[PDB]
Amino acid sequence: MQKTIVVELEDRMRHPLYGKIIRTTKKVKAHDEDSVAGIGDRVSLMETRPLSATKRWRLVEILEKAK
Amino acid sequence: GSVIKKRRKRMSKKKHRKLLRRTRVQRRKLG
Amino acid sequence: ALTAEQKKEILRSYGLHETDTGSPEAQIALLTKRIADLTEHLKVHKHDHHSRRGLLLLVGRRRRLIKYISQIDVERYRSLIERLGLR
RNA sequence: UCGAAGGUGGGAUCGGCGAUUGGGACGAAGUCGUAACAAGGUAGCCGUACCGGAAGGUGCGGCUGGAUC
RNA sequence: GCUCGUAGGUGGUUUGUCGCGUUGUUCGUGAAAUCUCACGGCUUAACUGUGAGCGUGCGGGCGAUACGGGCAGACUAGAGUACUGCAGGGGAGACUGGAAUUCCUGGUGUAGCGGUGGAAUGCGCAGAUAUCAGGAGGAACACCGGUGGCGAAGGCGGGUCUCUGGGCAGUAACUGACGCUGAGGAGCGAAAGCGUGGGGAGCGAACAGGAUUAGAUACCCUGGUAGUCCACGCCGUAAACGGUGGGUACUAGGUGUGGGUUUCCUUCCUUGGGAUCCGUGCCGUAGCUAACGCAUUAAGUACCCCGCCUGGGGAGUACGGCC
RNA sequence: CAGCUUGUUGGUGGGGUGACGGCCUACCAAGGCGACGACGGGUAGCCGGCCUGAGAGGGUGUCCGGCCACACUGGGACUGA
RNA sequence: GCGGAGUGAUCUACCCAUGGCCAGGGUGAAGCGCGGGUAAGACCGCGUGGAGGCCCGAACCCACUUAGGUUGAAGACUGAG
Ligand SMILES: [Mg+2]
Ligand SMILES: [Mg+2]
Ligand SMILES: [Mg+2]
Ligand SMILES: [Mg+2]
Ligand SMILES: [Mg+2]
Ligand SMILES: [Mg+2]
Ligand SMILES: [Mg+2]
Ligand SMILES: [Mg+2]
Ligand SMILES: [Mg+2]
Ligand SMILES: [Mg+2]
Ligand SMILES: [Mg+2]
Ligand SMILES: [Mg+2]
Ligand SMILES: [Mg+2]
Ligand SMILES: [Mg+2]
Ligand SMILES: [Mg+2]
Ligand SMILES: [Mg+2]
Ligand SMILES: [Mg+2]
Ligand SMILES: [Mg+2]
Ligand SMILES: [Mg+2]
Ligand SMILES: [Mg+2]
Ligand SMILES: [Mg+2]
Ligand SMILES: [Mg+2]
Ligand SMILES: [Mg+2]
Ligand SMILES: [Mg+2]
Ligand SMILES: [Mg+2]
Ligand SMILES: [Mg+2]
Ligand SMILES: [Mg+2]
Ligand SMILES: [Mg+2]
Ligand SMILES: [Mg+2]
Ligand SMILES: [Mg+2]
Ligand SMILES: [Mg+2]
Ligand SMILES: [Mg+2]
Ligand SMILES: [Mg+2]
Ligand SMILES: [Mg+2]
Ligand SMILES: [Mg+2]
Ligand SMILES: [Mg+2]
Ligand SMILES: [Mg+2]
Ligand SMILES: [Mg+2]
Ligand SMILES: [Mg+2]
Ligand SMILES: [Mg+2]
Ligand SMILES: [Mg+2]
Ligand SMILES: [Mg+2]
Ligand SMILES: [Mg+2]
Ligand SMILES: [Mg+2]
Ligand SMILES: [Mg+2]
Ligand SMILES: [Mg+2]
Ligand SMILES: [Mg+2]
Ligand SMILES: [Mg+2]
Ligand SMILES: [Mg+2]
Ligand SMILES: [Mg+2]
Ligand SMILES: [Mg+2]
Ligand SMILES: [Mg+2]
Ligand SMILES: [Mg+2]
Ligand SMILES: [Mg+2]
Ligand SMILES: [Mg+2]
Ligand SMILES: [Mg+2]
Ligand SMILES: [Mg+2]
Ligand SMILES: [Mg+2]
Ligand SMILES: [Mg+2]
Ligand SMILES: [Mg+2]
Ligand SMILES: [Mg+2]
Ligand SMILES: [Mg+2]
Ligand SMILES: [Mg+2]
Ligand SMILES: [Mg+2]
Ligand SMILES: [Mg+2]
Ligand SMILES: [Mg+2]
């Protein structure tokens, strides 16, 4: 989808009453000034000003490329 | 006397099946 | 079914080094052979349910093994999938 | 152009009533039986099927939450 | 009901790293009021004010890596493969064996047979029952047979052949955590039942007659249709029960029985004694339990995951929906 | 309540805004959300607090205070920071 | 009306042999391919295909309604459906 990237975030947090550690994910959008990205691509991101309706993130650096 | 608990269920199920057999036709098939 | 001299001829062709018989690839190979022959056995004898359950057991085993190999290394996954047949 | 309201239409969905009809619960010193509890007088239950005013009966398989040697 | 398996949850031993969880400290925020502590004043109080906690949480920085988590690895102990053996009613298909029941044909032979608590209906005198020979057909497979074996469960035995699944033991050859469980889902799932087509001996819901009885829509008798059997689909339920979900570790023993392996009198044959693995029973200690009882096959001691319960009826019913 | 989404998901050039932004528009691609509950149905202002409780919890959101929404019902602009 | 013997299936009923005819639209069965789905299938989505006493509708074959005709144009028709 044309210079847009989707990063699936991760977070773990203490369950409020049963006290377990719940694993909760996200699916969020980040920018690509260059539209090169495979599937996988452990990458990092930081916030920006919105560039679309649900755009809030930007890719900063790509590491351990999709193998 | 644990069989009594089975007999109550038996009677209820028996009467329900008897009602269904009384109405397996447009008595109930329409509805 | 799958006598010794019948399993060796795919042990050399699918196992790694002249004695490998328990690697992911080897296990996929002979499970696939077993599933093939047992599917022939089930195309005849349509209603041999107790052996068809054994077939599903082998299928589940091979599915766990293919997911194992796809996690551990993906190039060998690709090679084994091309040289056996998937989907 | 967009536009609330309005109009037209076919659906969706939530309710009320409804001749008639079905079961449920609770009531009373009613009528017909006696099905279960003892081997409860044919051991009883489970599923299923058929039959019977009614409990129930019977068939098939099963259980012991029954017996016998 | 059982199993497989998706998401998820959970995960053996070890090395190094990250420091996300976790954890330490500080900074900031967590308004005021409220609540708590101490004083102060409204005559005390309620109420108020001031100072100190609360503000459990969150964001930044600086520490840590014991545990959890990510990553890069390693190991064989879990798991799986290989090899050698082993037991078995595990399954499917085809062919096939004998007893027995029924019927038919004939031989004999005559007045009963059958059945019951006692009878009658009924069968027979047109030749029944009985007996002999032959034949047709269907179903189930005596003795083996067990308390046993196998299968996830449901279930599974006449024999032979063909195909086929699982399980157990031993070697340590191989892989190297690939495991466990499993919401949903899928498959299998006694009997009854349903569809189509076959088959139909015996049995036998329904039905009919006889009997019993106050009645007898029953129990008993005489017949007897579906069904029971087969092929292929459907159904998806059972006291589908051990009324006990799966996995794993540990916690006296005693005694059977089933399948392996291994050491001592080893040729004293004894096919005794011991150890070990996997079953399968009984009895029993600790422990547990309301008690009954369970008790290394736990209902004990623990951990992981799932299913389920929250008084009895109404009701596993109505409505909706799916099949 | 299992399929919801077409200006919906993104991009480009524009427009527009105080400001980023499908906020709007022309074109291009066909994406985004969801079993961690989308979409839907019902109910409801939220909170520091208040009630209860040993606490965790359960109920509740009235005085005070903070935030939001509304102003007969529904739709829209103007001035002006 | 009865009987005997003949005549008739150039009408009509059925059948037999051999020919002919059915504008134009529409729908979209099996089958066959590709893809998804899983191990394999089921199954599903697309195409393709062109089935059917299939649909609409001329010719053609009928004859439902209605009006007309009813000393008819016609001893059974015409018009409109
Ligand atoms: Mg842009
Ligand atoms: Mg008692
Ligand atoms: Mg009424
Ligand atoms: Mg009684
Ligand atoms: Mg009874
Ligand atoms: Mg009696
Ligand atoms: Mg009785
Ligand atoms: Mg019964
Ligand atoms: Mg009866
Ligand atoms: Mg029985
Ligand atoms: Mg398993
Ligand atoms: Mg599983
Ligand atoms: Mg998983
Ligand atoms: Mg994990
Ligand atoms: Mg660990
Ligand atoms: Mg004072
Ligand atoms: Mg004071
Ligand atoms: Mg105060
Ligand atoms: Mg405060
Ligand atoms: Mg091992
Ligand atoms: Mg066998
Ligand atoms: Mg014989
Ligand atoms: Mg016969
Ligand atoms: Mg004779
Ligand atoms: Mg005879
Ligand atoms: Mg290795
Ligand atoms: Mg489930
Ligand atoms: Mg099934
Ligand atoms: Mg059956
Ligand atoms: Mg049948
Ligand atoms: Mg029937
Ligand atoms: Mg039949
Ligand atoms: Mg009888
Ligand atoms: Mg009778
Ligand atoms: Mg067969
Ligand atoms: Mg049940
Ligand atoms: Mg059973
Ligand atoms: Mg149960
Ligand atoms: Mg357990
Ligand atoms: Mg044992
Ligand atoms: Mg004991
Ligand atoms: Mg207990
Ligand atoms: Mg209740
Ligand atoms: Mg129901
Ligand atoms: Mg319904
Ligand atoms: Mg547009
Ligand atoms: Mg643009
Ligand atoms: Mg712009
Ligand atoms: Mg309101
Ligand atoms: Mg309390
Ligand atoms: Mg308020
Ligand atoms: Mg008020
Ligand atoms: Mg007013
Ligand atoms: Mg202005
Ligand atoms: Mg004449
Ligand atoms: Mg003639
Ligand atoms: Mg002619
Ligand atoms: Mg002629
Ligand atoms: Mg056409
Ligand atoms: Mg087609
Ligand atoms: Mg037609
Ligand atoms: Mg023509
Ligand atoms: Mg003509
Ligand atoms: Mg005609
Ligand atoms: Mg007329
Ligand atoms: Mg005409």
From Swiss-Prot, chain C:
GO terms for biological process: translation. SUPFAM superfamilies: S15/NS1 RNA-binding domain (SSF47060). One of its GO terms (cellular component) is cytosolic small ribosomal subunit. GO terms for molecular function: rRNA binding; structural constituent of ribosome. Keywords: Ribonucleoprotein, Ribosomal protein, RNA-binding, rRNA-binding. It comes from the Bacteria. CDD domains: Ribosomal_S15p_S13e (cd00353). NCBIfam families: S15_bact (TIGR00952). One of the primary rRNA binding proteins, it binds directly to 16S rRNA where it helps nucleate assembly of the platform of the 30S subunit by binding and bridging several RNA helices of the 16S rRNA. Forms an intersubunit bridge (bridge B4) with the 23S rRNA of the 50S subunit in the ribosome. Belongs to the universal ribosomal protein uS15 family. HAMAP family: Ribosomal_uS15_B. PANTHER family: RIBOSOMAL PROTEIN S15, BACTERIAL AND ORGANELLAR (PTHR23321), SMALL RIBOSOMAL SUBUNIT PROTEIN US15M (PTHR23321:SF26). Part of the 30S ribosomal subunit. Forms a bridge to the 50S subunit in the 70S ribosome, contacting the 23S rRNA. This is Small ribosomal subunit protein uS15.
